[PDB]
Design a protein around this ligand. Sequence first.
Ligand SMILES: [Mg+2]
Ligand SMILES: [Mg+2]
Ligand SMILES: [Mg+2]
Ligand SMILES: [Mg+2]
Ligand SMILES: [Mg+2]
Ligand SMILES: [Mg+2]
Ligand SMILES: [Mg+2]
Ligand SMILES: [Mg+2]
Ligand SMILES: [Mg+2]
Ligand SMILES: [Mg+2]
Ligand SMILES: [Mg+2]
Ligand SMILES: [Mg+2]
Ligand SMILES: [Mg+2]
Ligand SMILES: [Mg+2]
Ligand SMILES: [Mg+2]
Ligand SMILES: [Mg+2]
Ligand SMILES: [Mg+2]
Ligand SMILES: [Mg+2]
Ligand SMILES: [Mg+2]
Ligand SMILES: [Mg+2]
Ligand SMILES: [Mg+2]
Ligand SMILES: [Mg+2]
Ligand SMILES: [Mg+2]
Ligand SMILES: [Mg+2]
Ligand SMILES: [Mg+2]
Ligand SMILES: [Mg+2]
Ligand SMILES: [Mg+2]
Ligand SMILES: [Mg+2]
Ligand SMILES: [Mg+2]
Ligand SMILES: [Mg+2]
Ligand SMILES: [Mg+2]
Ligand SMILES: [Mg+2]
Ligand SMILES: [Mg+2]
Ligand SMILES: [Mg+2]
Ligand SMILES: [Mg+2]
Ligand SMILES: [Mg+2]
Ligand SMILES: [Mg+2]
Ligand SMILES: [Mg+2]
Ligand SMILES: [Mg+2]
Ligand SMILES: [Mg+2]
Ligand SMILES: [Mg+2]
Ligand SMILES: [Mg+2]
Ligand SMILES: [Mg+2]
Ligand SMILES: [Mg+2]
Ligand SMILES: [Mg+2]
Ligand SMILES: [Mg+2]
Ligand SMILES: [Mg+2]
Ligand SMILES: [Mg+2]
Ligand SMILES: [Mg+2]
Ligand SMILES: [Mg+2]
Ligand SMILES: [Mg+2]
Ligand SMILES: [Mg+2]
Ligand SMILES: [Mg+2]
Ligand SMILES: [Mg+2]
Ligand SMILES: [Mg+2]
Ligand SMILES: [Mg+2]
Ligand SMILES: [Mg+2]
Ligand SMILES: [Mg+2]
Ligand SMILES: [Mg+2]
Lengths: 88, 117, 71, 101
Amino acid sequence: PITKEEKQKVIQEFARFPGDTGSTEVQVALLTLRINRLSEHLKVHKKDHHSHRGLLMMVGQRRRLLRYLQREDPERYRALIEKLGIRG
Amino acid sequence: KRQVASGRAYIHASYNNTIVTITDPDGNPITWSSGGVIGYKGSRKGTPYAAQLAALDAAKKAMAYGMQSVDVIVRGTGAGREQAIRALQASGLQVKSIVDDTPVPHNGCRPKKKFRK
Amino acid sequence: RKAKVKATLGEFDLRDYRNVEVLKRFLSETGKILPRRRTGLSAKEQRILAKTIKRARILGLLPFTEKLVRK
Amino acid sequence: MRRYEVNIVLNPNLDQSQLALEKEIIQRALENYGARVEKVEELGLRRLAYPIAKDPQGYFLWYQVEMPEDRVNDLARELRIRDNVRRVMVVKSQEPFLANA
RNA sequence: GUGGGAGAGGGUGGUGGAAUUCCCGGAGUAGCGGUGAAAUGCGCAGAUACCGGGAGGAACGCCGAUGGCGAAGGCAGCCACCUGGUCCACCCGUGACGCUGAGGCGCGAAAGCGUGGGGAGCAAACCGGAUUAGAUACCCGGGUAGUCCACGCCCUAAACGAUGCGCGCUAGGUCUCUGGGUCUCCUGGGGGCCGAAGCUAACGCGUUAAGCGCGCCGCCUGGGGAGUACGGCCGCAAGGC
Ligand SMILES: [Mg+2]
Ligand SMILES: [Mg+2]
Ligand SMILES: [Mg+2]
Ligand SMILES: [Mg+2]
Ligand SMILES: [Mg+2]
Ligand SMILES: [Mg+2]
Ligand SMILES: [Mg+2]
Ligand SMILES: [Mg+2]
Ligand SMILES: [Mg+2]
Ligand SMILES: [Mg+2]
Ligand SMILES: [Mg+2]
Ligand SMILES: [Mg+2]
Ligand SMILES: [Mg+2]
Ligand SMILES: [Mg+2]
Ligand SMILES: [Mg+2]
Ligand SMILES: [Mg+2]
Ligand SMILES: [Mg+2]
Ligand SMILES: [Mg+2]
Ligand SMILES: [Mg+2]
Ligand SMILES: [Mg+2]
Ligand SMILES: [Mg+2]
Ligand SMILES: [Mg+2]
Ligand SMILES: [Mg+2]
Ligand SMILES: [Mg+2]
Ligand SMILES: [Mg+2]
Ligand SMILES: [Mg+2]
Ligand SMILES: [Mg+2]
Ligand SMILES: [Mg+2]
Ligand SMILES: [Mg+2]
Ligand SMILES: [Mg+2]
Ligand SMILES: [Mg+2]
Ligand SMILES: [Mg+2]
Ligand SMILES: [Mg+2]
Ligand SMILES: [Mg+2]
Ligand SMILES: [Mg+2]
Ligand SMILES: [Mg+2]
Ligand SMILES: [Mg+2]
Ligand SMILES: [Mg+2]
Ligand SMILES: [Mg+2]
Ligand SMILES: [Mg+2]
Ligand SMILES: [Mg+2]
Ligand SMILES: [Mg+2]
Ligand SMILES: [Mg+2]
Ligand SMILES: [Mg+2]
Ligand SMILES: [Mg+2]
Ligand SMILES: [Mg+2]
Ligand SMILES: [Mg+2]
Ligand SMILES: [Mg+2]
Ligand SMILES: [Mg+2]
Ligand SMILES: [Mg+2]
Ligand SMILES: [Mg+2]
Ligand SMILES: [Mg+2]
Ligand SMILES: [Mg+2]
Ligand SMILES: [Mg+2]
Ligand SMILES: [Mg+2]
Ligand SMILES: [Mg+2]
Ligand SMILES: [Mg+2]
Ligand SMILES: [Mg+2]
Ligand SMILES: [Mg+2]
């Protein structure tokens, strides 16, 4: 699974400031963590479909958030993307 | 001619026939009987009366082998299993205990169409 | 009206599959696991007790089946 | 690392030398699979509900351990290779859930 | 975000006992089986019943519910691992990032198809025994595909709550699962029954709406002809849209 350790690490990483937990950046980070994870899982276990749905959903949430960021502040969006390496 | 004198009595009782096997304490048969072993042929093999008669045949045939006390074990639910037990009850054989062993699965095998639903 | 298995006990770990003389209290004349009617357990309770019993059986501590005496 | 309980049920006919040897192998395996032993309860022989391996009874070992998860199955695998090992049950440790306390 | 929770949600590997069947052995002997009654069938090459040993496959009794989980299909022995969803408390973080969703893409019971395994029990087709006025069927004895597994197709259904999704609003009572609480009880989230107002052709629905509203999607337009014909798309085919 994903330990509190690793998670806290990715928050501390992407946080806009100290204490920042639920900002778009962070959310996208966490989401991408879970997605790479779940995706690695599905690379094996080609048959676990129910989990795959979860994948789809996580992907969607992430895209919506990215979409928002891009509309709002293209700067921080480009930063976020290049930082996570997502589609670019 | 073992002259056994104490043993087990298995009543296998089905909607169809009743059949009784007397055995030594290690479970090896000595004598046996059934609705068919006596006069009965068709469905008559299953009535409780046939059961009584059969248990009694097994009994007598066993006492000839010199047997005195026996432990009853009852497999299957069928007309007159209770009758066969009752027949041993006083067969002259002392019945030491009765026990119900009826096999039931934890659901292994698909039943015949007759037995499902 | 007989009595319920829970009332007849003090504190006991429902998760302890090693402990027998408590567990066997929850099996019938046969080795069947007793209904809530008889166990007096709650939903969650009963449900935990099941797995407990089962583990116990696999460990060879409690039976899957028993013969029925008299009859 | 996570925290489990390894139950071992082995041959009750075992003499002292052989029993020492099996406990030896068990310890060694536990080590090579990366587990640390927090505590052990050796109950020894006890009367089984149903016969296992033609035997009316069995010798009981219980270990509480902390070990790496991705290992655990192999551990059990290895533990069962022994001809003399009748049952092995590894279980994730849980807290007590009680009633009437 | 933090801290908890319940769960047959999913995938992988392992493992347990009951039973069936078959094989080996012991003991035993005249029948067993089966039906309304029977017969075919099986049995002196020793069956049935009983005891011990073995192989193998498939499904998991009690728990078990009126229960739970899942978007649906669906999911049930136990163990570990991998993994999805979801509920509660705190009210800490972002600051409208929302809803719906043509097409697309994915999932999709059973049966069916392809290749390769597997095959205990069951069992379309089939071979028999009976019943009947005949019996192509209902009952009985056999039995192949199939049922099981891997991978790839198929895309249907009384795929049913015959009730699209989301949010707000409108009496209560009672039982229940699962949280948190100052724990007769209050407060969340599910599952049920009865019922206010209201709705309804009626039957019924009624905070789990079939009420009162707004948003968006799908769909209907008399019964046949017909889910047929033609065309197109998909499919190895059966056939599907
Ligand atoms: Mg008969
Ligand atoms: Mg072994
Ligand atoms: Mg949260
Ligand atoms: Mg959490
Ligand atoms: Mg599950
Ligand atoms: Mg599973
Ligand atoms: Mg498995
Ligand atoms: Mg068996
Ligand atoms: Mg033989
Ligand atoms: Mg008739
Ligand atoms: Mg013959
Ligand atoms: Mg003949
Ligand atoms: Mg001869
Ligand atoms: Mg046997
Ligand atoms: Mg075979
Ligand atoms: Mg076996
Ligand atoms: Mg039930
Ligand atoms: Mg649901
Ligand atoms: Mg294991
Ligand atoms: Mg989880
Ligand atoms: Mg705030
Ligand atoms: Mg602010
Ligand atoms: Mg949607
Ligand atoms: Mg399908
Ligand atoms: Mg299928
Ligand atoms: Mg064909
Ligand atoms: Mg096939
Ligand atoms: Mg073959
Ligand atoms: Mg058959
Ligand atoms: Mg016929
Ligand atoms: Mg006909
Ligand atoms: Mg016919
Ligand atoms: Mg008929
Ligand atoms: Mg047939
Ligand atoms: Mg074929
Ligand atoms: Mg409809
Ligand atoms: Mg819709
Ligand atoms: Mg939504
Ligand atoms: Mg509470
Ligand atoms: Mg409610
Ligand atoms: Mg409630
Ligand atoms: Mg209610
Ligand atoms: Mg009214
Ligand atoms: Mg009215
Ligand atoms: Mg109502
Ligand atoms: Mg309300
Ligand atoms: Mg209406
Ligand atoms: Mg309507
Ligand atoms: Mg409306
Ligand atoms: Mg019109
Ligand atoms: Mg018309
Ligand atoms: Mg059609
Ligand atoms: Mg045309
Ligand atoms: Mg056409
Ligand atoms: Mg295609
Ligand atoms: Mg073509
Ligand atoms: Mg068709
Ligand atoms: Mg369609
Ligand atoms: Mg359609």
